[PDB]
Amino acid sequence: FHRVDQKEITQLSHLGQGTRTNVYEGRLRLRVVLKVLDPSHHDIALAFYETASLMSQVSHTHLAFVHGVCVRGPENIMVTEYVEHGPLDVWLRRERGHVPMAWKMVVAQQLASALSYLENKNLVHGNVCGRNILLARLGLAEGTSPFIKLSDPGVGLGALSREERVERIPWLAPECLPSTAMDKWGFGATLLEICFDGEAPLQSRSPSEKEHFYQRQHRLPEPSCPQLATLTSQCLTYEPTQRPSFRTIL
Amino acid sequence: SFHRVDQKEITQLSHLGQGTRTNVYEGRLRELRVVLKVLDPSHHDIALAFYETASLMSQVSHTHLAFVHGVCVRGPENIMVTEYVEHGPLDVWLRRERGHVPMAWKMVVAQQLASALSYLENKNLVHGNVCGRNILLARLGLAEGTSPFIKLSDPGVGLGALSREERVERIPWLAPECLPSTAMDKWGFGATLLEICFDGEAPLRSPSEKEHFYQRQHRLPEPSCPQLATLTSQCLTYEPTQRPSFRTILRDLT
Ligand SMILES: CNC(=O)c1cnc(Nc2ccc(F)cn2)cc1Nc1ccccc1C(N)=O
Ligand SMILES: CNC(=O)c1cnc(Nc2ccc(F)cn2)cc1Nc1ccccc1C(N)=O
């Protein structure tokens, strides 16, 4: 990745928080988003640099751009693309009950296209969820279509604690609780989240209840949209090898 | 004239901005995404000028003119239900993108605006409120890379119903002969080309200073873009009859 000097960036409004990060709007000497990692252990910083490296070596219409990394004292900052309308799950909740099925199907194909590209290069995202799908275009006007970008996955999944992995249920693949196959589960859980207008299954459950659900191999709900019922059931199987490829899904 | 929309058919969503005696909101029409132009509580003569705009826009059809769905009366509020475009007003977008809007992009917008105005001129219809704020971006042409697409918004409350103070606030888009005809839209068009060339920074100042500028017949700046210098000078002439027709302007833009 490219090294960004702190003199080149300006930090502005707080947008949200990610795993061990704070997300801000900023400027790059361009409007950008700064993902500021908390003062962390070197294993976390390394997992953060690996994500920056991954995202800097890939290029796809539906993957967000990474400008580089800035080290500012104990803070590691990923300088990333600012996407106009921000996270999908937030927008879906605000528009609940008024998002058509045809709109949701365009998003699903766009996400599957980004993930087919990653699968073809044997690259793992590991954090596919509605919060990480950014809306570049809303597709609300007649004769327009939405346009998404999959955000970077942030701190790599391998560096997170068990508690953080439990917090990621139901997007977390069950084999990760104790491969590219994990993104098929994340994709399936995100399609459920989309079908339910940004209300993910198991959102009102405790960490203990979420861990129990996976330990007993309980299966996530069938979506309310019949067009994605078979696809989600095939993606949300506990046996990773039985999940379909993104070429097939797409 | 226009379709009547019952308030049960509309949902009022987020505030987008304000126009002359109006508040603009995003909305839904039973669904389609729309924009609701909510007129302030007004006298009957102001409401009538608002209905006249709704009637005008409902009787015309052009790919670069915004569609009007109809009018809803909600207590003392008159609401024009209009077409929603994804990216909003041109002047706002230009200021945010200042310094990286190429000249070829600005020329597509100019041709598209001249096309809408040639259509109105051919029907002897006056817009009276051509400005960057009223040019709506349906497409930026950036994600797909294929060029912008605009819609000229409705003119809102008819210019004839506004006060002198409101007309002075509309300088430099206001034609000077309107301070105390389709010719007025050439001036508005010319002032909008300047505004576009300057990345949404229009020329001109206090109301008194703007009124003096017109009283002394001072001429607006020459644009920084040499491709539109002659066209703007011809459109921004104080003698209305000396302004070129939109048929001519539209052929010159090719
Ligand atoms: C790689 N780039 C991004 O992740 C990114 C790009 N554009 C954004 N626009 C935006 C626009 C309006 C608004 F109100 C909020 N955000 C937000 C972004 N991140 C987030 C922002 C907040 C919470 C989570 C994320 C995240 N998943 O990182
Ligand atoms: C006839 N239809 C319209 O005029 C109209 C259509 N679509 C819009 N989309 C949009 C999308 C995102 C956003 F941030 C803001 N706007 C804005 C519109 N009006 C305006 C909105 C604000 C201020 C003035 C006008 C105006 N000139 O009336």
From Swiss-Prot, chain B:
Residues 10-254 form the Protein kinase domain. It comes from the Eukaryota. Changing residue 127 to R: In a colorectal adenocarcinoma sample; somatic mutation. Phosphorylated. Tyrosine kinase of the non-receptor type involved in numerous cytokines and interferons signaling, which regulates cell growth, development, cell migration, innate and adaptive immunity. Plays both structural and catalytic roles in numerous interleukins and interferons (IFN-alpha/beta) signaling. Associates with heterodimeric cytokine receptor complexes and activates STAT family members including STAT1, STAT3, STAT4 or STAT6. It is linked to Immunodeficiency 35: A primary immunodeficiency characterized by recurrent skin abscesses, pneumonia, and highly elevated serum IgE. Interacts (via FERM domain) with JAKMIP1. Interacts with PIK3R1; this interaction is important for cell migration. Interacts with MPL/TPOR. (Microbial infection) Interacts with Epstein-Barr virus protein LMP1; this interaction inhibits TYK2-mediated interferon signaling. Belongs to the protein kinase superfamily. Tyr protein kinase family. JAK subfamily. This is Non-receptor tyrosine-protein kinase TYK2. The lineage of its organism: Eukaryota, Metazoa, Chordata, Craniata, Vertebrata. The chain holds residues 580 to 867 of 1187 of the full protein.
